[PDB]
Each structure stands twice: as C-alpha cells, then as structure tokens.
DNA sequence: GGTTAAAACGCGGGGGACAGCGCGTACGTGCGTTTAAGCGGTGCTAGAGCTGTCTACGACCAATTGAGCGGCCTCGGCACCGGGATTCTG
DNA sequence: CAGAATCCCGGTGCCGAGGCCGCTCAATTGGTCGTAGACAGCTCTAGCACCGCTTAAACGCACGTACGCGCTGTCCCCCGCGTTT
C-alpha cells in the first residue's frame, strides 16, 4: 500500500541549494522526521492560539504568531519574510 | 538603572530562603544578570501574546501562558 | 514594577499592565531564583566550600541546561 | 490550470499541507493562506539546514550527505542548536571536545 | 616501549569522538531488554525497536557522563566518582 | 542476570566518548543501575502502547512515542 | 463558572468541620483544569495513533495508566471502572 | 435525573462531556469517557484535600491555605512526581538545612 | 555451526586522591544615618467590555486529470585493503 | 632517536543513490451556501497620576575570626600492557 513522504521535495530543494550533492537514505529519513516535527509543533501552537481567542479558523495571522513564538532570533525574522513574500505573490 | 533596585539585602533574603549560609560578593550582580535574562524572555513572550490578541493592556493570563510555554506552570492566577 | 516596565518598553511602547500580571511575574521570578540558589548551594557543598561562588551558579545553569 | 505551489512560487506541496491541516483536528476551519505560509516556512528551514549540511560535506570531502554531517551542521549553528536542543540523531555521534585541563 | 599513563587515554578519547559506531554489543543488550521486558509475558519485538533503544541509551549515557566530567573538573579532580554522577542527576532533576 | 553483559570495556568506551580521562572503579555499578532504570521506564511505556494497540509485537514507532513522551525525540526511525 | 461548589462538596465528605480559603480554591481550580487538559490531550493522541474517530473509556484508561504514577494509577483505574460499571448497572 | 446521580459521583459529568465535545480532541466521544474522567478527577481532588486537611490539623488551623497545599503535595512521594514542574503562589518551600552547615 | 573480536584476569608502578597545617582577609555581627517603600486619599480616563449588521470567507459538492508513490534496472561514490612516508611520544 | 600511530597514494569492486517508466488518488476548478467575525456603536472601572504621610528598609561603617587557600607528605588505585578464556 502506498504511503506519503517528503523525499522528492527535499531532493528538489537540495538540487537548488547544491547542484552537485547527494543525500543518503538515512539522511532523507531524518529530514522527514524533522519536517514532520516542525509541522506538528507549529500546527499545535496555532491551534492553541486559535483556541485562546475563540476562533473557528486558523489563518495566516495565527501561523505567523506561532512561528514568531517558536523560532529564536533572526531565523524567525527570515521565516516571516519568506512566508509574507510567498503569500503576497500568491494573492496576485 | 532600575536593575539596581533589586537590593543587596533582597538577594541575601532570597539566598537565606534557599538555604545559603555565606554569600560571596559577586553573587549579586550575577543574580541581577540572570533575573534580567529570565524576565526578558518571559516578557517577550507575554507581549507577543498581547500583540496577537490586539490588546494594549497585558493580562495576567498572558503571563500564565508564557510561563507555561517556558515550562513552569503557575497555580493561582487563573 | 519599575524594572518590569523598563524592560517591557523595549518590545512595545506605551503599554499597560495588570496588577495580577505583575504579581505573577514576581512569584515566578522568586521561585526561579529560589530553585537556582537551592541547586547552587548543593554545587558549592560538593566543592567542599561554605561560601557560594559565581562559578557554582554557572555550573548549576550549565548542568541544568541554561 | 496551475498548481497552488506554482501559483505561490514554492517547492513544498501546498495541497498536502492543507489536507493534513483539515484532517488533523486543529480547528473547525483552515485559512486559505495558512498552508502557503507554512509551506514557505518549512521550505526555508529545509534550505537553511541543507546549506550547512552541504558545507559540512564539502569540508569533509564527500559527495553524499550523511547523518554525521547533519549532526555537525546542526550543532555547529547556534540558532539550530537552540531549536533542536532536545533531539537525538541516530548515528550522529558527538562533537570533538576535550577540556583544556585534561591535556598538558 | 610504553606510552605514559593518560596518553593512550587521550588517543582513545579522540578516536572515539571521531567515530560514530555503537559501543555496546548487540547480543548482550538484546538479552537484557528481553529479560527486563517480562510487564507482559511472551512478547515479540521488531529489530528496529532494539536499535532505537540502543541508540537512545547510548546517547543518554554520553550526555550524563559529560555532566559527570564537568562536575569532577569543578571538584578539581581528574577521576570521576559516583558522587559526581549523583550530583549530576540531582541537579538534572531526576 | 543479563545486566552484567554491559561490560567494563563498553562503559569505558562510552566514557571515552564522553570525554573522561580517568575512571574510578565504582562507576560501573552506578552506570548499570541508571541504565536499568531508564530502560525500565521506556520499556514500560512501550509495552503500555503495545497492549493498548492489541499487538503481540512491540513496534519501533511505539519506542519512538515513549521517547517523545519522556522528551527525547529520536530521529531516524520514522 | 468553575468547580468551586463541587470542590466544597468533595471537601465536606473527607473533612466535615473545616474550611478553605479562596486562594486555595483557585489553586484547586487550576489543578483540576490542568489534569483535565493533560488527560484529554493524551487521549486525543492515542485516538490518533490508531486512526479511530472516537475517544472511549478504554482510551481514557490508557491515558491515565500512562500519565499517573503506579499506586495512584491503580486506584484511579479502580474508581473509574467502578463508576462506569455503576453508570450502566 | 443527573448522570452524576446515576454514576454516584460528585463532579458534573455533563460539563465534562460538553468540554470534550467542544475542545477539539476528536470526532466522537464514547458515553463512558466523561464518567471515567470525572471519577478520576474526583479521586485526585479527594486525595489532595485529604492531605491538605491533615496538614492543616497538624498546625491547629481550620481553613486550608496555600502553604498547607504546598506542604501536603511536597510531603508526598507520588504527588510531588506528578506536580514536579508546578509552582504554587504563596506556597514557599520545605524547611531543611544541610548537615554540613550545622555546628 | 564456525571465526575471531572481545572480555576478563595479573602485574608493575605511576597518578592523583587524601589528611593535615599555617596563613590572609572576606564576609559576618553590630551600629547609626539616610532613603524611599508602602498608605490612603482624590481624581481622570484608556481601554476592556457588552450590543448588533452583513458580506467575506471557508466548507462542501462534481467533474476533471496529472502529480506522486512505486517497481526495475543502472552505475559510480565509497569503503576496504595494501605498501609506504611521516608525527609524536618517551 | 627508537618505535608506536598516523596519514598518504593507489587499486579493487560493490551496494546504495539514482533515472526511467506506470498508474492511483488526490489536487484543481467551477459553483452553492451558511455564518464567522470584522466591524460599528455605547458603557465604565482598574490602571495610572499627584499628594501628604508613616515608617519599613537599605546602606555605610567598625572590626573579628571563620574559612578559603596554598603547600606538603604519602599511600590508595587506576592505567597500561600482557595473557587467557
């Protein structure tokens, strides 16, 4: 039976940030674990926030708040910048 | 400089409550720095919660949520 | 209260506080410092010293994970 | 017809993230922009970590990226070390570190 | 010819911090796990489970010993002693 | 008595990886006790998950979930 | 609304001639809320790991067994089982 | 009649049921979940209050105060484990002095 | 069932862990002076909070169809083994 | 300066990282509908500010010996190596 993964997407990213570089299967599994872990953290924080303000809908604002709360230092700044850029381009 | 408001005898009092018999002369500044860092983190989180809530006043529940986020649950201010 | 106000000014200008919001901060801070000193005293004793030293505080924070 | 990933200029899949959100018991409704923002964040983090991984691989004269390289990249960066300070990586090992008082 | 006491110790420190392999033998560890898993009689295990247990255990022991060494150094000693481990686990919150 | 299978050379190698130069002769029993306690806790949680799942076989994901429960978050096993 | 009156009703059964301050009442309120949140979240995870729609008494029991210490957990399970039995019988 | 009366409990089953159905934990809830949870909560509350009262009687008092809760919780082996990471306001600490400091 | 990596056992003696001493001065116990922390009283109001519009938004449904997980060859990055020149210790 | 460790260049060949081809199912679009909640408006109370007051408390100074420290003698035990199972 078929199962979901992130391997191809990670490989596409890697081929963008290192045109000539291979990645082992163990590394791919670790990366899948990391992606899943971060996704869970952000989603749960967003739900907790959405519950605090009695909102039925989780919107980009809650996600941004969650990310800001969760990532330390300039990394949060860059993350917010990237997300905002992506959303802005998405609307147009 | 309001950090100096945390008086030397006040730090001695906290230590006495902790069970310290003799205090060195540099403990006070180190404690000042530590407390500053801790308060900075907690306040940053609390103001983040407030600004997300669109409030201008900082509620106590925000302090509670921040302390929970740090991992120090507080009973009483619920 | 003055210290909390001062350090809060660095995140959002013209804020306002609740009395309980400050009481909770004071409670948490006092408890945190009490625990820190409790561990530091053990550290000093393990060092076979009565006097408590900053190095003991640093060791306590390091081992604790801060 | 064009994919939402293509419409957003991202490499991670918007749709799968949307489905995982709507099938994860997080809220009653999900904003149309939340998955785009989240996918952007995840793609940025992935690129960020992979850059240091590839730098480690180049430093160790290797073409493939190995868990030891991931360990080195994560622990050699302060922000990542704070972010993943409670994560154990299999076959990752540790950092070379000897205290100055142990050696003459 | 003899290497002076501690030299080979440093050599081992370097080489084992360089390496990434496991240190505990698989068969003894598997026997230990399957012995102390007797909670529920007549159990069955996936190999990956024992591998993850071994990984986590070795990681936890390494992390503990690091603090043990820190304590011993703080005590102005080279040799680690059980009291150092006890202090580490006391401060750590166990 | 399989706890004696965690041999003195193995513990010495682990310490070496930890950065210890000189090892006392009494470390090994304490290490054995600590390892036993940790393994007991994790295995208890894993067995609990397995019994709830209605499974004879203890899966790796169960071990991962226990470690996540205790705050270890092992990567590389799904 | 809160659990104050229910706490009182519990208090009077184990100590008739005693009182309790409002601060203690709030502390107990927080404790009840905290334990409820912990157990509920654990049950929600367990119900997710097995891909089941419903949280059942079995799920809550699994969560309790995971969360509480032993001697406490055993008595908790016994009380819950007695209660759920009486609920139907 | 109230479900608590049927179950012989003291905490309200119905409010717990509503909180479960409202707190976004799953798609469905079994009839027995709230009753079991209420029983557990009642047992824990009774345990805490019993120890608190014992602590209060030990100091010739009739009203339970946060200090008494602190003493009761921290003077127990398992409750302390359960509430290791909880700070109680106006709770204080346990009196103890290291033996290497007394003359 | 076989191979051999490994663990355990003996020995020499160097490493350092320990008990003890004389010494210096840091922090303790105590006092008198100064500061401003708390009271409470009076006052203003910023901003939290409670009544209510309506359309912006997401959930849901049908139909379409190509993006993603997989199977199967493919082939070169890397470990392994070898002979040798070369740091480092003692 | 013996000699144990280590790095270096080189050859062997394999197993695991990958490209290509198939085809589920899931991602997109067009469309309908209910209502979430952003917003518009009216209400008022803890927070904040000023003032005189009591007095709780911090602080500088005197000065003693407690104890933190450096040094010494010595013997407890751990490492490093060789042998056996």
PDB file of C-alpha atoms in Angstrom, chain H:
ATOM      1  CA  UNK H   1     -32.095  12.785  36.774  1.00  0.00           C
ATOM      2  CA  UNK H   2     -28.474  13.934  36.567  1.00  0.00           C
ATOM      3  CA  UNK H   3     -25.924  11.477  35.198  1.00  0.00           C
ATOM      4  CA  UNK H   4     -23.771  12.083  38.283  1.00  0.00           C
ATOM      5  CA  UNK H   5     -26.581  10.705  40.434  1.00  0.00           C
ATOM      6  CA  UNK H   6     -26.644   7.588  38.259  1.00  0.00           C
ATOM      7  CA  UNK H   7     -22.862   7.255  38.486  1.00  0.00           C
ATOM      8  CA  UNK H   8     -22.743   8.127  42.178  1.00  0.00           C
ATOM      9  CA  UNK H   9     -20.071  10.774  41.632  1.00  0.00           C
ATOM     10  CA  UNK H  10     -19.807  14.401  42.731  1.00  0.00           C
ATOM     11  CA  UNK H  11     -18.216  16.190  39.776  1.00  0.00           C
ATOM     12  CA  UNK H  12     -20.620  17.044  36.933  1.00  0.00           C
ATOM     13  CA  UNK H  13     -20.490  14.562  34.075  1.00  0.00           C
ATOM     14  CA  UNK H  14     -22.370  16.819  31.676  1.00  0.00           C
ATOM     15  CA  UNK H  15     -19.936  19.730  31.802  1.00  0.00           C
ATOM     16  CA  UNK H  16     -17.038  17.362  31.139  1.00  0.00           C
ATOM     17  CA  UNK H  17     -18.961  15.917  28.197  1.00  0.00           C
ATOM     18  CA  UNK H  18     -19.506  19.400  26.785  1.00  0.00           C
ATOM     19  CA  UNK H  19     -15.838  20.317  27.255  1.00  0.00           C
ATOM     20  CA  UNK H  20     -14.741  17.165  25.439  1.00  0.00           C
ATOM     21  CA  UNK H  21     -17.195  17.798  22.599  1.00  0.00           C
ATOM     22  CA  UNK H  22     -16.014  21.427  22.500  1.00  0.00           C
ATOM     23  CA  UNK H  23     -12.248  21.270  22.995  1.00  0.00           C
ATOM     24  CA  UNK H  24     -11.409  19.802  19.582  1.00  0.00           C
ATOM     25  CA  UNK H  25      -9.919  16.499  20.671  1.00  0.00           C
ATOM     26  CA  UNK H  26     -11.597  14.078  18.255  1.00  0.00           C
ATOM     27  CA  UNK H  27     -14.628  13.475  16.058  1.00  0.00           C
ATOM     28  CA  UNK H  28     -16.596  11.392  18.570  1.00  0.00           C
ATOM     29  CA  UNK H  29     -16.768  10.547  22.268  1.00  0.00           C
ATOM     30  CA  UNK H  30     -17.977   7.374  23.928  1.00  0.00           C
ATOM     31  CA  UNK H  31     -20.670   7.587  26.567  1.00  0.00           C
ATOM     32  CA  UNK H  32     -18.315   6.274  29.243  1.00  0.00           C
ATOM     33  CA  UNK H  33     -15.416   8.674  28.736  1.00  0.00           C
ATOM     34  CA  UNK H  34     -16.778  11.630  30.737  1.00  0.00           C
ATOM     35  CA  UNK H  35     -17.878   9.444  33.654  1.00  0.00           C
ATOM     36  CA  UNK H  36     -14.460   7.805  33.923  1.00  0.00           C
ATOM     37  CA  UNK H  37     -12.677  11.131  33.716  1.00  0.00           C
ATOM     38  CA  UNK H  38     -14.955  12.651  36.336  1.00  0.00           C
ATOM     39  CA  UNK H  39     -14.284   9.725  38.647  1.00  0.00           C
ATOM     40  CA  UNK H  40     -10.537  10.179  38.217  1.00  0.00           C
ATOM     41  CA  UNK H  41     -10.775  13.899  38.897  1.00  0.00           C
ATOM     42  CA  UNK H  42     -12.912  13.312  41.982  1.00  0.00           C
ATOM     43  CA  UNK H  43     -10.449  10.766  43.334  1.00  0.00           C
ATOM     44  CA  UNK H  44      -7.473  13.057  42.790  1.00  0.00           C
ATOM     45  CA  UNK H  45      -9.267  16.021  44.332  1.00  0.00           C
ATOM     46  CA  UNK H  46     -10.273  13.959  47.353  1.00  0.00           C
ATOM     47  CA  UNK H  47      -6.697  12.772  47.816  1.00  0.00           C
ATOM     48  CA  UNK H  48      -5.306  16.300  47.631  1.00  0.00           C
ATOM     49  CA  UNK H  49      -7.923  17.677  50.002  1.00  0.00           C
ATOM     50  CA  UNK H  50      -7.415  14.849  52.491  1.00  0.00           C
ATOM     51  CA  UNK H  51      -3.695  15.509  52.657  1.00  0.00           C
ATOM     52  CA  UNK H  52      -4.356  19.244  52.850  1.00  0.00           C
ATOM     53  CA  UNK H  53      -6.718  18.792  55.779  1.00  0.00           C
ATOM     54  CA  UNK H  54      -4.236  16.560  57.566  1.00  0.00           C
ATOM     55  CA  UNK H  55      -1.595  19.237  57.067  1.00  0.00           C
ATOM     56  CA  UNK H  56      -3.985  21.877  58.399  1.00  0.00           C
ATOM     57  CA  UNK H  57      -4.966  19.947  61.515  1.00  0.00           C
ATOM     58  CA  UNK H  58      -1.254  19.451  62.184  1.00  0.00           C
ATOM     59  CA  UNK H  59      -0.918  23.222  62.724  1.00  0.00           C
ATOM     60  CA  UNK H  60      -4.114  23.862  64.718  1.00  0.00           C
ATOM     61  CA  UNK H  61      -5.997  25.505  61.865  1.00  0.00           C
ATOM     62  CA  UNK H  62      -9.472  25.105  60.408  1.00  0.00           C
ATOM     63  CA  UNK H  63      -9.027  26.755  56.985  1.00  0.00           C
ATOM     64  CA  UNK H  64      -6.836  25.297  54.257  1.00  0.00           C
ATOM     65  CA  UNK H  65      -4.238  27.773  52.999  1.00  0.00           C
ATOM     66  CA  UNK H  66      -1.830  27.591  50.048  1.00  0.00           C
ATOM     67  CA  UNK H  67       1.060  26.835  52.404  1.00  0.00           C
ATOM     68  CA  UNK H  68      -0.838  23.755  53.566  1.00  0.00           C
ATOM     69  CA  UNK H  69      -1.353  22.633  49.971  1.00  0.00           C
ATOM     70  CA  UNK H  70       2.363  23.076  49.364  1.00  0.00           C
ATOM     71  CA  UNK H  71       3.298  21.007  52.400  1.00  0.00           C
ATOM     72  CA  UNK H  72       0.826  18.259  51.519  1.00  0.00           C
ATOM     73  CA  UNK H  73       1.914  17.973  47.894  1.00  0.00           C
ATOM     74  CA  UNK H  74       5.648  18.174  48.546  1.00  0.00           C
ATOM     75  CA  UNK H  75       5.494  15.839  51.556  1.00  0.00           C
ATOM     76  CA  UNK H  76       4.164  13.040  49.326  1.00  0.00           C
ATOM     77  CA  UNK H  77       6.208  10.716  47.151  1.00  0.00           C
ATOM     78  CA  UNK H  78       3.900  10.442  44.142  1.00  0.00           C
ATOM     79  CA  UNK H  79       2.091  13.788  44.107  1.00  0.00           C
ATOM     80  CA  UNK H  80       5.439  15.579  44.012  1.00  0.00           C
ATOM     81  CA  UNK H  81       6.353  13.478  40.996  1.00  0.00           C
ATOM     82  CA  UNK H  82       3.028  14.405  39.422  1.00  0.00           C
ATOM     83  CA  UNK H  83       3.432  18.120  40.197  1.00  0.00           C
ATOM     84  CA  UNK H  84       7.193  18.448  39.873  1.00  0.00           C
ATOM     85  CA  UNK H  85       7.046  21.321  37.372  1.00  0.00           C
ATOM     86  CA  UNK H  86       4.258  23.319  39.062  1.00  0.00           C
ATOM     87  CA  UNK H  87       4.844  26.488  41.083  1.00  0.00           C
ATOM     88  CA  UNK H  88       2.238  27.319  43.734  1.00  0.00           C
ATOM     89  CA  UNK H  89       1.785  31.006  44.505  1.00  0.00           C
ATOM     90  CA  UNK H  90       2.361  31.919  48.144  1.00  0.00           C
ATOM     91  CA  UNK H  91       3.499  28.345  48.644  1.00  0.00           C
ATOM     92  CA  UNK H  92       7.039  28.622  49.914  1.00  0.00           C
ATOM     93  CA  UNK H  93       9.470  25.751  50.286  1.00  0.00           C
ATOM     94  CA  UNK H  94      10.215  22.837  52.624  1.00  0.00           C
ATOM     95  CA  UNK H  95      12.292  23.639  55.742  1.00  0.00           C
ATOM     96  CA  UNK H  96      15.581  21.766  55.547  1.00  0.00           C
ATOM     97  CA  UNK H  97      19.207  22.521  56.387  1.00  0.00           C
ATOM     98  CA  UNK H  98      22.220  20.662  55.041  1.00  0.00           C
ATOM     99  CA  UNK H  99      24.020  18.696  57.733  1.00  0.00           C
ATOM    100  CA  UNK H 100      27.410  20.187  56.796  1.00  0.00           C
ATOM    101  CA  UNK H 101      26.276  23.655  57.913  1.00  0.00           C
ATOM    102  CA  UNK H 102      25.060  22.980  61.436  1.00  0.00           C
ATOM    103  CA  UNK H 103      27.765  23.414  64.119  1.00  0.00           C
TER     104      UNK H 103
END
